[PDB]
């Protein structure tokens, strides 16, 4: 019965004008969206973007494509999409995106007897996500995907999440090592520009950075170097070579840790939480060496045990205060 | 009434010659430009370029496309653009640019009954921006986008900013961490080449680098190392191991800071402000060690307290002078 199906489809496309939306000049065409999230491959702080792979499905009725006498849904080769009207959907905050092309264009067209068109695409998109790194790496980010009609206003087209809160599937599949997905939300609104009002759908995720890596890699070495710096205060004040060596070397160790670290992050003009911590730790170890200079300055140069004894208590206590204030402010 | 609209549009394009501009052989076609700045994604000192995303709209009248008996503006599928004349607009200082293509070519065509064509594109461009880094990182840059007709002279085409000072929107949207947009300006002029005079529109931005990151990351460590170097002058002159160790280690710390730093910047042949500062700080810490050599040279080897006492005052005072001159010259 392949000649009959071929005839029916040929008839559908005979005189079909791709230039005109369904119901041109009439009420807007309602387009239902449905996303299946395959993956979020990457999240980049330095590039302020993320990479998403998804199955993007669009659902609308085109009465020009209605067919009778066939009680099936016709799955057609993806090349038929070039002979049909499709919505002019784009991702307003995308940086670079493509439809996968192996072994064929990852595209689907399914027609229904009533003229419903189910148009599916498999898309990888790099999309902008401005991040607030003031609390980094104890930060929570809101990365969105903004879906809009490019040229058709709300007079001509309308979007909705098909299935409401179930329109987006596969959020459980997202496996980012550095983030957990706390929540996702679906929004619908109209956005006004100089050229008119346009339909908008917004998918957003709340990403929460896992602290564990940073505690061990950046925070703990810093804490141990700062504590190490305090050993000087228990060393004899006559051991000038030993105590000056300890002060300098710890300072220089703190510089090597800092500079190495800075190859991992974007060139932001503001203070991250980690920058504030490392700057605090640097100041502590610097003051520990300066403490010896004061002891050195008056013992030989002009109580000495008293100044050391105060340092033995005041430095760890101040570091405890510093940590308390820091971790309360940021956690 | 879709057959009537289809007929009208078919009639418009019947015998339409894309090769000939509107009013060929007559007065120039006036093309109004209008930009909506979506984002400035990146600014690169090393590549001397920036990346802009915008909605680029062109506005002109083509009397060949005038239609009667339809009191609507026709929004057409973007593929109709291939059957129309459009201006041969290009970005003279662009390095790499593309029209976004997902899910369709991010392109709009809107016709008006009087033959006005509204042609919109969503473009991402990497565009050249020669930067003067003599004051880096206290610098102000002028990055431009130069818009020109490729092949049509001012005999054949003319550009204007449609809306004057409102032709460019979305400057408030630009969120570059490392820069603030101080100002934008719109210019119109004619540019003469060997092949004739061409219309030009220029959009420029004044970018001001935020100092905050650099004070903390590069300036403050340098200041603290230089101050640290001075501790030597308060140490006993008999503590040869201690004082020589302090001098060298600080020098070596200053080298590690310098070399790490240099992976962030372009290979410019001139002195940035930060290069001048780091070179000054290196000289200070180097002179502090050489100061000890002089003390060392005459105490043992051949007043000693006098030379140290002068160093205790002259070095911090000279560094204060150095900083005063530096920060006045550059701020």
């Amino acid at each position, epitope marked *: 019965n392949m000649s009959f199906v071929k005839e029916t489809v040929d008839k559908l496309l005979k005189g079909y004008d791709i230039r005109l939306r369904p119901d041109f000049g009439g009420p807007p065409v309602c387009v239902g969206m449905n996303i299946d999230i395959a993956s979020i491959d990457m999240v980049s702080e330095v590039n302020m973007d993320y990479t998403l792979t998804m199955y993007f499905q669009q659902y609308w009725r085109d009465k020009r494509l209605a067919y009778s006498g066939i009680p099936l849904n016709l799955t057609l080769d993806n090349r038929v999409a070039d002979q049909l009207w499709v919505p002019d959907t784009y991702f307003l905050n995308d940086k670079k995106s493509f439809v996968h092309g192996v072994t064929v264009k990852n595209r689907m067209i399914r027609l229904h007897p009533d003229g419903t068109v189910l148009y599916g695409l498999r898309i990888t998109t790099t999309a902008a996500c401005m991040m*607030d790194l003031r609390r980094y790496p104890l930060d929570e980010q*809101n990365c969105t995907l903004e879906i809009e009609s490019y040229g058709y206003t709300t007079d001509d087209i309308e979007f909705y999440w098909r299935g409401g809160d179930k329109a987006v599937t596969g959020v459980e599949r997202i496996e980012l090592p550095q983030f957990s997905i706390v929540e996702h939300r679906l929004v619908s609104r109209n*956005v*006004v*520009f100089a050229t008119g009002a346009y339909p908008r759908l917004s998918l957003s995720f709340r990403l929460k950075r896992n602290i564990g890596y940073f505690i061990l890699q950046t925070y703990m070495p810093s804490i141990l170097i700062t504590i190490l710096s305090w050993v000087s205060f228990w060393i004899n004040y006559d051991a000038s070579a030993a105590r000056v060596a300890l002060g300098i070397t710890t300072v220089l160790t703190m510089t090597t840790i800092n500079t190495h670290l800075r190859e991992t992050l974007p060139k932001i003009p503001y203070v991250k939480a980690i920058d504030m911590y490392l700057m605090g730790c640097f100041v502590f170890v610097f003051l520990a060496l300066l403490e010896y200079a004061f002891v050195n300055y008056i013992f030989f140069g002009r109580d000495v045990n008293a100044i050391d004894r105060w340092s033995r208590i005041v430095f760890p206590f101040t570091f405890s205060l510093f940590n308390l204030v820091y971790w309360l402010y940021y956690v | 009434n879709m057959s009537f609209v289809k007929e009208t549009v078919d009639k418009l394009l019947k015998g339409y010659d894309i090769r000939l501009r509107p009013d060929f052989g007559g007065p120039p076609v006036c093309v109004g430009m209008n930009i909506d700045i979506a984002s400035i994604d990146m600014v690169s000192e090393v590549n001397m370029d920036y990346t802009l995303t915008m909605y680029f709209q062109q506005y002109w009248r083509d009397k060949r496309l005038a239609y009667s008996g339809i009191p609507l503006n026709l929004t057409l599928d973007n593929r109709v653009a291939d059957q129309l004349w459009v201006p041969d607009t290009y970005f003279l200082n662009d390095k790499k640019s593309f029209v976004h293509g997902v899910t369709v070519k991010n392109r709009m065509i809107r016709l008006h009954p009087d033959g006005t064509v509204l042609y919109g594109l969503r473009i991402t461009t990497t565009a050249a921006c020669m930067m003067d880094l003599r004051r880096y990182p206290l610098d102000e840059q002028n990055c431009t986008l130069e818009i020109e007709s490729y092949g049509y002279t001012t005999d054949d085409i003319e550009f204007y900013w449609r809306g004057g000072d409102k032709a460019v*929107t979305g*400057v*408030e949207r630009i969120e570059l961490p490392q820069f*603030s*947009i101080v100002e934008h300006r719109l210019v119109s002029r004619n540019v003469v080449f060997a092949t004739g005079a061409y219309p030009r529109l220029s959009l420029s931005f004044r970018l001001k680098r935020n100092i905050g990151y650099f004070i903390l990351q590069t300036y403050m460590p340098s200041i603290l190392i230089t101050i640290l170097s001075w501790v030597s002058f308060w140490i006993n002159y008999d503590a040869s191991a201690a004082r020589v160790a302090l001098g060298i280690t600080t020098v070596l710390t200053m080298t590690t800071i310098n070399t790490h730093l240099r992976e962030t910047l372009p290979k410019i042949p001139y002195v940035k402000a930060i290069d001048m500062y780091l070179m000054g700080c290196f000289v200070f810490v180097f002179l502090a060690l050489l100061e000890y050599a002089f003390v060392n040279y005459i105490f043992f080897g051949r007043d000693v307290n006098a030379i140290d006492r002068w160093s205790r005052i002259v070095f911090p005072f000279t560094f204060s002078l150095f900083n005063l001159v530096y920060w006045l010259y550059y701020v």
Partner: nanobody, 121 residues
Framework: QVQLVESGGGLVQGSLRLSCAAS????????MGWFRQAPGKEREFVGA????????SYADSVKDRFTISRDNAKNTVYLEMNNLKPEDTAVYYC??????????????????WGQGTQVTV
């Protein structure tokens, strides 16, 4: 989730300083707009400021008359209403705009509306 409290609506004929104090997720809503509602008339754009950068724009009526700026420390925006006129007699409202929420001028693009200081002159 943004909360906006506005204050400093006095009476003049003169220079005035409206203030607009924000709290909550202000990062997601980088733009603050000033509107004003005269009795009867539609809500009308006055000006807008980006939190980050202070990129400013004004309606013609208030161009070179009013001046907006901010301080990110307090999360506060101010409309410095200099050279006042009897046309400038309205309920001035503050509002927050999302990053991708459209044109500055259109009040339907804005989500979180301040109370609205009445100002008469």
């Amino acid at each position: 989730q943004v909360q906006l409290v506005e204050s400093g609506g006095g009476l003049v004929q003169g220079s005035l300083r409206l203030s607009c104090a924000a709290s909550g997720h202000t990062f997601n809503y980088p733009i603050m707009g000033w509107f004003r509602q005269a009795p009867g008339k539609e809500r009308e754009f006055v000006g807008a400021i980006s939190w980050s950068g202070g990129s400013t724009s004004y309606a013609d009526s208030v161009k070179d008359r009013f001046t907006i700026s901010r301080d990110n420390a307090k999360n506060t925006v101010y409309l410095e209403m200099n050279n006042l006129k009897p046309e400038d007699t309205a309920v001035y409202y503050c509002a927050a705009k999302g990053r991708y929420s459209g044109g500055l001028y259109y009040p339907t693009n804005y989500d979180y509306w301040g109370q609205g200081t009445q100002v008469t002159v």
